[PDB]
Amino acid sequence: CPCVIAQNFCEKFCQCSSECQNRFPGCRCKAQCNTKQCPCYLAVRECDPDLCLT
DNA sequence: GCTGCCGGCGGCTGGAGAATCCCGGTGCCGAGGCCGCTCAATTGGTCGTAGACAGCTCTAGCACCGCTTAAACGCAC
């Protein structure tokens, strides 16, 4: 999987399956997806507005 | 003396993962009516267990005295 060999996840535009484990879940955080807990914040990214519906 | 310096400290934050409530449908099983019959109630006689009274007399309590040893006291460790 090019995603895999790239040591990178799958983005919703990948052709990894709709359940391909190489995808990424998305922010769930409650107060702000901002502090040292929120997973997006760790694997430094911005919680996409399709996922962090929280 | 004080400079970092460093470690710990407790205090807090908030994610996370399970336990909680609610509601919406759904049955099978408590619950109730039914018929009946057999066993429980009614009537009636008895004689004997069981209650009395009147009993004897054994023994369980009270005491007393004198004994002694087991109890009580303390005591280093």
**Residue A46 neighbours by CB under 8 Å, 6+ apart:** A40
Bin A14: left if φ > 0, else alpha if -120 < ψ < 50, else beta.
beta
Residues with CB under 7 A from strand B: A 28-31, 35, 37-39
The CA–CA distances, whole Å, from A1 to A11, A24, A26 equal 13, 15, 21
The coordinates were experimentally obtained by: cryo-EM
**What's this structure's resolution in Å?**
3.5
Q: CB of A52 within 8 A of CB of A26?
A: yes
Nucleotide closest to A37 measured between CA and C1': B15
Q: How far is the CA of A9 from the C1' of B64 (A)?
A: 111
Task: Determine how many CB atoms are found less than 10 A away from the CB of residue A47.
Answer: 20
Q: How far apart are CA A47 and CA A12, in angstroms?
A: 13
